[PDB]
Write a protein that binds this ligand. Sequence first.
Ligand code: SF4
Ligand code: SF4
Ligand code: SF4
Lengths: 392, 66, 111, 148, 184, 57, 335, 212
Amino acid sequence: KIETRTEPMVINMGPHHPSMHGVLRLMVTLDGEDVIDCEPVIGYLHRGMEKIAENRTNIMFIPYVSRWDYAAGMFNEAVTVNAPEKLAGIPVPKRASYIRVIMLELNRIANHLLWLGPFLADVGAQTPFFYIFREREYIYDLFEAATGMRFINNNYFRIGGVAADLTYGWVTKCRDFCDYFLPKVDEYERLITNNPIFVRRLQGVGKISREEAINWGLSGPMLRASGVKWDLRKVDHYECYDDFDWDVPVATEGDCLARYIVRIQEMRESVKIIRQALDGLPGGPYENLEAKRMLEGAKSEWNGFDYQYIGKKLSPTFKIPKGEHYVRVESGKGELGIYLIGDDNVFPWRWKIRPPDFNNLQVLPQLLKGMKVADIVAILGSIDVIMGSVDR
Amino acid sequence: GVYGALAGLYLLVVPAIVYAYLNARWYVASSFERAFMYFLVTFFFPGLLLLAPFINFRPQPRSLNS
Amino acid sequence: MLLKSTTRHVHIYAGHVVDGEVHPDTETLTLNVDPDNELEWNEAALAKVEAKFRELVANAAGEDLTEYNLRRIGSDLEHFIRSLLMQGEIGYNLNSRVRNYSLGIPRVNHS
Amino acid sequence: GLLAGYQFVKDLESAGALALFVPPEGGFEGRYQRRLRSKGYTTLPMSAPGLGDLAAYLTQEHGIRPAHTGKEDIRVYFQPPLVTYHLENLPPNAKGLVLWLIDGKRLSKQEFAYLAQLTQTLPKFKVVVEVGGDRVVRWEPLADWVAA
Amino acid sequence: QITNYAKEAVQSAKYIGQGLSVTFDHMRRRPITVQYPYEKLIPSERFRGRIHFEFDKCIACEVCVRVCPINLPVVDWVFNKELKKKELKHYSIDFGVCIFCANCVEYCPTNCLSVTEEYELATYDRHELNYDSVAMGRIPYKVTQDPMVTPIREFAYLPAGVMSGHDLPAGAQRAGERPEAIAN
Amino acid sequence: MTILPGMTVKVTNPNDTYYQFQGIVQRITDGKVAVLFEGGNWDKLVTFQASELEPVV
Amino acid sequence: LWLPLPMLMMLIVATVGVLVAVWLERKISAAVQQRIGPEYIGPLGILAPLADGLKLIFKEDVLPANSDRWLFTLGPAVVVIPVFLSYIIVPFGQNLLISNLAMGVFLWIALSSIAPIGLLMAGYASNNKYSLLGGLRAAAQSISYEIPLALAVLAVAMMSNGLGTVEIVEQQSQYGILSWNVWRQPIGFLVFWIAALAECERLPFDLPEAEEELVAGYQTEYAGMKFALFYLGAYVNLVLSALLVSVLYFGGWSFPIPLETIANLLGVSETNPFLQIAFAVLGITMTLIKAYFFVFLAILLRWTVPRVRIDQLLDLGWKFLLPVGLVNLLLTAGL
Amino acid sequence: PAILNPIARPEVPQELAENIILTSLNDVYDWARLSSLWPLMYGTACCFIEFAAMIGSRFDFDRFGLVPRNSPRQADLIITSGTITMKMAPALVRLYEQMPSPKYVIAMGACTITGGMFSSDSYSAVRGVDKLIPVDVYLPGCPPRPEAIMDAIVKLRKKIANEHINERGNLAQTHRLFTAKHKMKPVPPILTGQYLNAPSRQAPPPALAAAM
Ligand code: SF4
Ligand code: SF4
Ligand code: SF4
């Protein structure tokens, strides 16, 4: 039976784990009310993604990739198609580059909204959990129109660009959505900054210094929430993200309150990049791009290498050239990189996914040092974890 | 406790006319009418429970004129 | 600790069972084939898997007592019960509420 | 209404090929394959889109090709004919079997009529093809449903 | 003291007074919800429901197998040297193994394979999902041609301005396909 | 007019998600016709009710 | 066999008051989330409290592996028969009374103290680490919110000059609505309404494991009929607590004259037979209709305040709700 | 032989005689289980978001009577929404055995039917949840639409009504226990509950910090 002893009690968080960020198992040991140690047991969603890619071509592996960070979706397809297109020197058209910025900034909104709902229920008020997913369902139908699926399994990113152009009533439907969602971003911010009970669960709870964040290895809104200002869309001049004006959200506090305000400010800056890309589109709307295809179809300023969704539709037997590689994409959760080295055949020789959450979950034992029992899911909900990215 | 005088006026004949009202105006009702609509459920609830498997709120078939 | 190897048809535990409650031991291994009645057994083939269960326990009695090694025994039993279906010894249960045919569909031999 | 008797079993022995119109939220169709199963009739609930040609599936043996998934040759699993393999396992002291096809509304009318004319040429065998929807669960023969 | 508990109680018992009012104003709004079996929501023009098949179009070349992520579609074909052209005899895509990525409908020259809109495939048996060539060649189930479903539209298909599909009497998508053929 | 399996029709009714999309029809049945729309990347055929489909030459 | 008609007719009202609250829980919480609630069963969910309770009768109520059999079965029974017995107190109706006990607002606060024992033999007897921890957590929470709950009853005991619940509603019937104790005790209503909500509702409770302080609390290893006492007995405690809000502070069976217009939450005709049956039945169960307003307010308050932790729950009953309950008892007196 | 993987002939007559009264009680027995069955809040991989989108406002979870429970005992239905590896394969059977016997597992997504996209070459994925637990309704899709899960609930609801009240005996597991004694060396457990307080994190060891 259960006895009452005086030694520190170890509780198992269990692989059941009724939460929306995967399947962890924390063997966290308690000291009455404070924790003293915690080991995370990962690998419950290790499907062997790296061994699969050594027997997949690139068009056979593009459906596989949007399952690591399945909150994001096409952020996984961004790193995937950028690994042979930056190695073979394949030019991406300018219009397909701006569709990639449009799709990735909408994924970061959906990445942060799937983070936000479970995080607000873990820190207190459970009523925005049903009103946040309604706002993610608008982003689902924007991908369901352009691609053939809601949030993942959307084979849109290609090696020579993107799979197809947008639908007809699409560019006017962010102007219905991202002109309606942007008033609600400040509504989500005033939930925690106002009502000063939530700040007593997030100030100093899971604080990490700047010097320990670079050493432990962090990226995205967990590194930048310690006062680092490192963003790979600004640092790496990545696919016409440098054609816009947008500020990097930094909060030099380190705590979980700094991680909340950065991720809310990433939602706000993403709509800024979206509106600069919908108006900065080269051919504009597709129904107006196709309009100039019929009036000046012989040889125009349109129908060029740009103003189209792909450079050249490559064969399924596209051989990756020989050479090592490491492509980086600033996801909504951090740096999602892959270490591609390929031989001259269609299968890569090694496909090491460097996930943004695998390197942020190793700090979770150190953040759970002196924190309380009710502030364990408040820490784990603020790392923005998706297991499946951690375990692959 | 009456036998069949005022018991049937609360258990039988008035829940049938609320179910005529609940089927017609439940989703089209306004913010003030729905608050009275929730009151008719909780007040006539011992009568609403007996004639529950004898009324269905399933919508009618469409015509498909296109 | 209760090291166990629980597939659909094979539940190998590291311990002995006293009336439902499983107690973790070090010397013994308990096995009940088909917790759900998907296959209609008989007296002949239930002893045929005992010619396989005590064979694999005696064969792998030089290795470690881990969940990986109990899973290696529980897999080869589950590959042996499937061979009893392909030999036509046992058959599928029809009184079960599920008819999902986990060990392959019924099929005739050589068209 | 609500208190249903055993008129569904008698209509199946009369017509042989019924066509239920169940509520689309489910749960009310299966109360009539309990009255059917109480009268000795066993039930094989299959899926109507999953069947191929009903001649080559029900009364003839079919070569089902499993998922080789790139790591196997093209295997051909010759399954027994469905209605005449479940009849031989069915003992003669009990009555026949019924084909409770769900999602019948994606079957063509040529496959509706083939299931209608088969139930009398094959003894102790009936079908109940769940086709379409209605607010109240109701049945009709397949002979006039193809005549609609 | 006693002059504090009449002032330390007001600071949040009125904040829940301004919180009970906003949640009661959440009940004022119409329930934006898709009742499924009586209002099935219309899929998009690119939605990958399930794969269709044309047996009179598949010239036996196994491009669908080589572009599939798991090489799933079984193409059973003989060479048929009397006619010197390979003619298939069986075709099957075992759904349940099928992720609906639809690489086969994209890399096909003869336009045989094609995605439908029906997502309503759910069997009691795993092997009842191994669709035949004549089971995949069956006609899809359209949401609009069903006299029990009131089909509500999807976002990015409504007219410009409305973000709901319930109180939509008419309209189309928020743009025109060919509006500028006699203008420009 | 009647529809043969392989002609290019286009939809005419306004109370439909596919307003004016055109493509090759496929597998005409007793009351229904599926029209392969040839839309962009993944080709999609959608059932119709054998009407509101005006072909072009 | 149920020979007293005042005992049978009350028990029909005592169970249909719970089935309203399970219906009102799943429909008000759906209206604040802009979803339907249970459709397709009954007309609009009327059979959904019946369907959730009847499935727990038909399930194999199996015990855990190594458990104390007699303390596991009597676990939920210590929680819920103290809140099934104190329905003999609640006085709905002018001519309807079951028992004229000399107390009963003190007998209810005495009977509600057996409920922390049932949370101790539910945590211990289930015999896992996370439910014993949830057993000591749930027991020490209802312990904390009883002395504020007993001191709010002490406030309405000075004004009523007794603990008789027939006499308590008799002091609020001389002016209809101006003589209600909520107008005389504006603070002790809040001491009652927070402390009673911290022992029956879903908002200040760790039994939903959204914070993961345990596995699922003390009611983790309970299933079937034993969980039906934990599920359909926490709404018995919700209605019983809301019945006494509508007796102590709000006047039970107290309401003004119904000779009003069509906007009196009624029909259109002044002399209607539908209003002669909505006046006679309302003359039988009136404070149930008033308790349906605080059941509704308990569901509405769940989606407003944050899901507060256990360290600030117990620092509210002792550090806040107990001194504001002590000074209210002095302000109810002369001082 | 004659037929591979044969169907055993049911020799019992299944004398399922019943009057009007007992089947009228069987209808209430089946309706009470199909119409308010409580799914476990379970999810491993991507299909939990499509399952959690059905919890939300656009698609109503609690409309068929489905209330999500974060406990195996209170829930009966368990929608396996996610790819299960070699790990979570003993954890899902443990979630399955801790349920009252009208369980009705439904598989959701391609990776609980045949292990869909990891069915080709993956060293730790069980190919289909039906290699561990019996499944009532299968649901293809990757991921399925939230409308497509509510069809699988409707297909499940039609299966509860087929269940008979006198066929309640096969819902309990049969116990064909066997016993063998082994000679495997017992190993101390690898994952003990200390991570930071382990005696290797405080300082780097000698014969390695000299070259640092
Ligand atoms: S991809 Fe098209 S052409 Fe190639 S085998 Fe398949 S159906 Fe035939
Ligand atoms: S949908 Fe995917 S798995 Fe299925 S046939 Fe097409 S490419 Fe292959
Ligand atoms: S098939 Fe895809 S969506 Fe479904 S469980 Fe597996 S990874 Fe998730």
